[PDB]
Design a protein around this ligand. Sequence first.
Ligand SMILES: [Zn+2]
Ligand SMILES: [Zn+2]
Lengths: 458, 94, 490, 550
Amino acid sequence: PEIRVTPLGAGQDVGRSCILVSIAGKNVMLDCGMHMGFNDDRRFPDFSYITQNGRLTDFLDCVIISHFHLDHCGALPYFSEMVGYDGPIYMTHPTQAICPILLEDYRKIAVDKKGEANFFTSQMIKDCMKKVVAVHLHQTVQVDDELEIKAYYAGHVLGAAMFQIKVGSESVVYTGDYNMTPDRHLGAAWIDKCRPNLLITESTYSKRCRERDFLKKVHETVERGGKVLIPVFALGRAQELCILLETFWERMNLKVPIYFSTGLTEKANHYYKLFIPWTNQKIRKTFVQRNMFEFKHIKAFDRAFADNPGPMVVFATPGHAGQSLQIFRKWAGNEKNMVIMPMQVEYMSFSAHADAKGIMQLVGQAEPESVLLVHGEAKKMEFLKQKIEQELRVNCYMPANGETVTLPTSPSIPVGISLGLLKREMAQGLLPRLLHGTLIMKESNFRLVSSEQALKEL
Amino acid sequence: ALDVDATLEHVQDPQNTVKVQVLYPDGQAQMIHPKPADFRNPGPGRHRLITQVYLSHTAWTEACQVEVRLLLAYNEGTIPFSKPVKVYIMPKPA
Amino acid sequence: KSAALHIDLCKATSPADALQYLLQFARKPVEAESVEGVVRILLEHYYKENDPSVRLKIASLLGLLSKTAGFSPDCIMDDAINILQNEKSHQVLAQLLDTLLAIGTKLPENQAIQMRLVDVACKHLTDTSHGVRNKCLQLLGNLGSLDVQKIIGDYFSDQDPRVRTAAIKAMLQLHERGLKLHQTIYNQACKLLSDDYEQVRSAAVQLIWVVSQLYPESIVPIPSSNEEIRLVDDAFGKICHMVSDGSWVVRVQAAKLLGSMEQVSSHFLEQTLDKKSGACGAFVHGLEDEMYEVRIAAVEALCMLAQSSPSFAEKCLDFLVDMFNDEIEEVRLQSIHTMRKISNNITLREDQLDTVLAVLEDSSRDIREALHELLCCTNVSTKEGIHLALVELLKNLTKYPTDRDSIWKCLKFLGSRHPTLVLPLVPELLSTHPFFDTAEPDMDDPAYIAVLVLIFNAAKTCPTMPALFSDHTFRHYAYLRDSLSHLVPA
Amino acid sequence: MKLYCLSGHPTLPCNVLKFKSTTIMLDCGLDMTSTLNFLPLPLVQSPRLSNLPGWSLKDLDKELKECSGHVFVDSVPEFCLPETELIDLSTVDVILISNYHCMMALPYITEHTGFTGTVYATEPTVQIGRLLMEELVNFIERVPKAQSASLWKNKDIQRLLPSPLKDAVEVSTWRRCYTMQEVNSALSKIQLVGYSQKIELFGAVQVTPLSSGYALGSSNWIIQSHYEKVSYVSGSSLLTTHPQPMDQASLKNSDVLVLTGLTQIPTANPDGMVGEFCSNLALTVRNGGNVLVPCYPSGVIYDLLECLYQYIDSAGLSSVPLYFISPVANSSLEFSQIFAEWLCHNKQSKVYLPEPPFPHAELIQTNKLKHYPSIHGDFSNDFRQPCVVFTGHPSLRFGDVVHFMELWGKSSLNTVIFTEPDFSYLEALAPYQPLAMKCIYCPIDTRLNFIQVSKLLKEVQPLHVVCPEQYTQPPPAQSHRMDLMIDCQPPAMSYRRAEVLALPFKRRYEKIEIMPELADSLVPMEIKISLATVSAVLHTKDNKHLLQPP
Ligand SMILES: [Zn+2]
Ligand SMILES: [Zn+2]
């Protein structure tokens, strides 16, 4: 009658999301990500806690991947095809499209350039994706005879999902990454009144004004004849910038071009085009008029039209690295050299995750009886734990990496009630009337009938 | 398809009285009943009629004409209502 | 053909084809004396049939025949309550209560039959079925005793959410019919505002708004504090918390009801647009919601509350400026319209002004026209801002020449209401050299009329300096007075 | 418990399930076969249909026009609604919708009947039926005829009418086509759901949509209330179709299985009919004729466009243009492209690659298939004489198919090919009947036939089976084949229109939850099994019961 949770990954840190939940005798891992910034073989989570030279298929009944960010999904090919796991890997449909191409990109980064000796190949990336079972929104999939999981729209990236892990009467809701404010291409996070036993949520932390200022800067720089070189590093930020730009260019109706580069942002554009139901309300509603991800102004950059003169908008492949530094050096000391990091330099930052008030709202609206914090900074987690334990009067927890946290729960016994006794109790008392009956505690089932039904069926 | 824009002035019930007549150069005089959904009423005694009437005939050796006319119908016959307007039509062979 | 109905029902079959014959009969109108005859025949045939579906169809057909125009239903109520006396099927009982509700609604004047029907409803409210309780609550709401408020308040706490919604809608119908409600209703609806069902929450927030409008100045204590809060302020806080609901129609309902609470104190009004009790950040959350209907409803709530409170409009101003650039065109139309509505006396500073003038460049003609009427109704200091407005209007005229009449209306309203500020700008607009004889500008050039419409409307209310005009400007004044007399004044 | 039957159509049902304390409507089906009795609505006033001779009754000549011995009503085509007066539709709480074909007439229930409940359907059924409703309203309202004819719907006169008009049932309940604002108001109150999603209705029953395999988004429903389950099996396919395969495992151990939407004309292999369609199309366009395919904008048209895509390169018909004229044609193609998550594992493996899931999308970029909103706009400038046109309504009473048949019926080289089994082929051709066109009837119904449903019922083993009366009898076209009926170990339960079925599958044992405070206070006395005497106060909230210690 206990729920034991052990984050082997993030804990009181950012990156390498990996949380183990042992609810009601069934063990579920909640993400499997890699820690960027480490190169000393601490990228992948320490799976020696679960098994030391043992089979992970027996130990783990389910593996959940929240979204395609590498700190939540980057360690998946290693965990499957090197340590050994041939069980169900549950994942969202847009996540299952983006995850191979971001894993291959980091495989291209780590194997070619920056120190990967113990790593995964492309063949075992495909092998790991072959074990992935895709789930839809709000679909209750039965991994076991009694363990079921259900995905909720998280709105962090395309196909980011909040997972509720329910077995018996006990449920655990894990929210990998989410944002309670809608973006220009994504909706907001939504959860019903589940009232789970535990809410494992991220804890790491205006928008219209910032977007208007960025658009005004871009418009003022492009109306002066200069060219902007705004870079993008994440796929969600790139798609949001492209859709916000495209609706601005269509609204102002000026025809000077906007371009995006690389062979990966094009793949992201195609996958975002193929996953319209996982987008914002405007993109779904105005899809019948036109596909908003089929850009009529943002076109493919053949070296940014061979870096031709004139005012134009260019998207750089990284956020440094190649395919951006050549543009940065070729446009330094120009008329309008506006480069906006997340030789005029502007600073326009777009938040992809939720802030403190969004986490407060999610805890209030899901209404759990306990909250657990991962995926953030320790000081911010302490402040948010104080806010949780003060404003909503509900227990909060501070687990580090490898630090187990156990929670006592009170299961409710499912008992059948004979319909005659139930209708009799509906009859008298509706006008604190007691219900006196006999509990026939048979094998593997429970019946609670009247004394007459007890004696006639004794 | 032919789009019309009628400025109906002081029509009591344009929903069930105003009818569009298209008259081909031959004897065909097809009479079109507009739906009440596009009898716009921008003012008291003022009405706007925006229908996309549909025209078809077989091949012509030359673009002749077609005669578009509004009609008023009453409970048994119809009378001319608007100015006769000629539109050029050229059915080319397939 | 009432005897034909009698023969066909009692002669062909009992169980199944009688239902078909009743269904066929239900589709034709009956004259009032024949209504009385067929009502007597069907009520005689009610006791014969033991099939519940046939009796349900009988009850539905009685309810349909009671709604006929020329038939006075006062003579059939006693047999109706007699067949409710010994009816055991719950669906047939619910249909019979529907029939009785039709009887009561058709005869509003007779108080005795209304008291009899609400007595029947109070008798049958203890039924185990939710449908019977729902119909009895509807009966109490439609007739009442305008005791009934206490009973419906007791049934706010029923186990079935449908009965809870029926009770709230019944007492809302009681208020709408004219009955004045109590105050314990506020506590019960506040308890019910946190219901797990969407319809219960929507009905409860409607009831909270109604009881706030009935007793706005009532004083209620905080449950967790010694301080006392006005009732309208507390209900405003509750509806502001309901603005952050998980259901979007509940959010739309909460915003729409929040717009009608004009008696709220100013303190909570500055609270509801802040970003740092439960009313804090309600409109900030509502203006950035994913559903555009919620954003529209929050825009009209902002409009109503800023029309009520003049100090609220300054806080509404920058949020409307930020939300001019909105992804839905209807939302930005509504934002521009409400900005025009609440621009009665507040002045625009530089960044709000040139954000408006930046969104003037948009390709949509509808929001350009709406923003044109906003510029007609705007008040602005710092005459360089007026020069900036003129420059942006002139380049809009160059980019879109079809809007010349609207732009001329804008410049007429800008000159007529900012007269002293245009006055130092006149030598910069008319190219008046201090000593050189200037060439006569080309008339019928829409930029030049636009300048002159601004200048002449400024000169109407200020006769301080009309001598800054040259001779050809006076000739053009005569030409515009002859041609554009609805814009240029005398 | 009880089951009200508001529709007599097998593949267009409207069943109201009065189950415990919640009333569920299972689908709503607009019978468009009633429109066959009416004279077709053309885009232009055709000379042949206008001066058809009237039909006289010696007792109406302006109302009835006779074409080739068959009498047709000269009014707007009216639609046979589900019967909305047996049960008060303000008492129903939830409408569960399976197909977009079974979502028609939803504006009739949700607006005219005082229905204040909620509607559940999947994303693709709602979107595609929105498109189909849009083109239906457009087709009725392009060239508006009046509802002039009313005297023929009389009990004294319809007896005297000939057989196609006399056999029409519930004629007084027929209604004009709903308008677009009724469509918008009906579709505004639909709560969107996904496959295998639990929906709790007032804490009493639990409904989930299960994938059926017929159409993309099409779903079967199971209604669970504690220890009893009702399975609703609407139009489902066991063949290798584009949508997700049929979920047969979740239908198991159900007390009653309501099944509808079986195959019309079951004695037809759909693959053989696809082969016949492609062969006849190739034969016609090789002779210089024209192929007209009256079809819905979505559904079987995707399958036959896939097969025609695989066939044109083999047959060398790349020079033959394929025209798809529909007001919702572009929206249908785009909607088919983006609903990849609702397709089978073969189709949704294609979108893991940067590739469209349906192969008909490649026909646009190769310009083999051109789609237009209407005939008039730019199709009249891009029209080549030997061509294939997928257009119009398959009922042949409205849409662009009427104009195309009036254009092409005077030539024997042109052909019309019928792929939809919904409408009677002879009654569809009847108002056009003096035509030299060759008519090919190859229906591609991919729903469950009778051997498939026998295997399904042997696999599932429901305790009781509820089916329409037409499934117990042999089809009247055959009337002798004993294999063309539903046979089970219990002899089913048949229903007709406006019939109320009483299901004696109601049981005891409603589930309860006991808190651990009471669980410790109950001593497990040994009986051999165990016995315990409990005294508790019963707490009920949202139709869920709890036991509390006093
Ligand atoms: Zn993350
Ligand atoms: Zn993330």
